[PDB]
Design a protein around this nucleic acid. Structure first.
Lengths: 100, 50, 98, 154
DNA sequence: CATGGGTGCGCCAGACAGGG
DNA sequence: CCCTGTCTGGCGTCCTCTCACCCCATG
């Protein structure tokens, strides 16, 4: 991909663990059946006070070996071209040819 | 080392070190428990003499 | 009652690995509720083998993860004593279920 | 007013020293000069006359008082003597019942072959009174169910 | 089972009081 | 302070050969 692109991911990793999933109660409880006046307006708008690139929906999905955008596999956690050369090298514990 | 019978004939230094360690354990426990002044003075004095 | 759930990849190893804990539990408890089969997941994958176009050429990869159960019946206070810290077969992830 | 004093006995014969002390009191009938006797040190509620001092040191298997001097031996010296006695009693009456553990909480095992081992409680069952914690035995986590008293909270 | 607390030697010599 | 009496410490030959006996005590 790009060394520029792999740097943006770990920067957006640092936002997804510092702000989000910790200051996620801004929408978890306060944007529901609670005080639905314009104090609930302060729930949705203070969510915008945190940066836009901090959401876990923003952290796309990238490979860890080479960082290819597409063709990702969640189990191995790395790109489809990299899972195969490691399969033939004998690195993933158990991948043989599925010839059922 | 033991003798012919089997009872261990123990040296004198083991008595001395075992006394010092018994008293030191007692003094640590009394400073844990916050005993009064005269108790820990006798305890430290027995350790000094040991 | 006291279950022992086995997890591995090498199925030719797990039958001996369970046998290594059979012999460790036979001489202590003398009652073990068998090496139960416990069906295996077949996680199927497929990968575009090309680094580019021609989405016709693919390779299929799978991982048979085998499971077993030992299920020590009685908790006599010497059986588990011969089990904890006294196991083997590096690569076979073991777990109790109780 | 009767103040407290510390007596040293041959350590091990302390109950017999306490009984012989009560009996010497009721022999030499200085009943108005002794209040109690508490149990290698024997605590005595007392007053200080030289007659009662000779009485306590004439009790057998008693070395002497412990104080600043042997002329006028010393009552007691502690900011919280009552709390020190309460701590000594609490040592024998140690509850040690910590077992409460939620998910991801580390616990301690002190019973069964898993004794002397620590782990975390991935699942908890208050209804079944059982904690789901695994022990790092030979590397692999060994998820086992232990009772609250069977394990201690870490 | 494990722990818990005599009274017959004589000289030299220097340090510690003790007058002086 | 300058001499006098006291108080404690430090020490007293080398090799061997047997023997006898090594902490109670007890709730």
């Amino acid at each position: 991909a790009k060394q520029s692109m792999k740097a943006r991911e770990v920067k957006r990793v640092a936002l997804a663990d510092k702000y989000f999933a910790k200051r996620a109660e801004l929408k978890a409880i306060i944007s529901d059946v609670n005080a639905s006046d314009e104090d609930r307006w302060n729930a949705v708008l203070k969510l915008q006070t945190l940066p836009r690139d901090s959401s876990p929906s923003r952290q796309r999905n990238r490979c860890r070996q080479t960082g290819r955008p597409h063709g990702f596999l969640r189990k191995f956690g790395l790109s489809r071209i990299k899972v195969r050369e490691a399969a033939m090298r004998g690195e993933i514990p158990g991948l043989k040819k599925a010839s059922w | 080392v033991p003798l012919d019978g089997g009872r261990f004939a123990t040296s004198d230094l083991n008595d001395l070190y075992r006394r010092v360690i018994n008293r030191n354990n007692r003094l640590k426990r009394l400073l844990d428990l916050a005993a009064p002044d005269i108790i820990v003075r006798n305890e430290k004095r027995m350790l000094q003499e040991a | 009652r006291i279950r022992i759930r086995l997890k591995a990849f090498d199925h030719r190893l797990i039958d001996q690995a369970t046998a290594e804990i059979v012999e460790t539990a036979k001489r202590t408890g003398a009652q073990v509720r068998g090496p139960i089969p416990l069906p295996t997941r077949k996680e199927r994958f497929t990968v575009l083998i090309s680094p580019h176009v021609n989405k016709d050429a693919r390779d299929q990869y799978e991982i048979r993860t085998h499971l077993r159960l030992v299920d020590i019946v009685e908790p006599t206070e010497k059986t588990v004593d011969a089990l904890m810290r006294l196991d083997l077969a590096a690569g076979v992830d073991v777990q109790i279920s109780l | 007013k009767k103040r407290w004093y510390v007596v040293q006995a041959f350590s091990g014969f302390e109950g017999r020293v306490a009984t012989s002390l009560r009996e010497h009191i009721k022999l030499h009938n200085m009943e108005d000069l002794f209040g109690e006797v508490m149990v290698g040190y024997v605590l005595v509620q007392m007053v200080m006359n030289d007659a009662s001092w000779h009485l306590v040191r004439s009790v057998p298997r008693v070395m002497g008082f412990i104080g600043g001097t042997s002329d006028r031996p010393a009552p007691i010296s502690d900011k919280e003597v009552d709390a020190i006695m309460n701590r000594l009693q609490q040592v024998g009456d140690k509850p040690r019942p910590k077992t409460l553990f939620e998910p991801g909480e580390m616990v301690r095992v002190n019973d069964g072959p898993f004794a002397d081992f620590n782990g975390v409680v991935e699942e908890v069952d208050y209804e079944k009174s059982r904690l789901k914690v695994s022990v790092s035995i030979f590397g692999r986590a060994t998820p086992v169910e232990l009772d609250f008293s069977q394990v201690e909270k870490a």
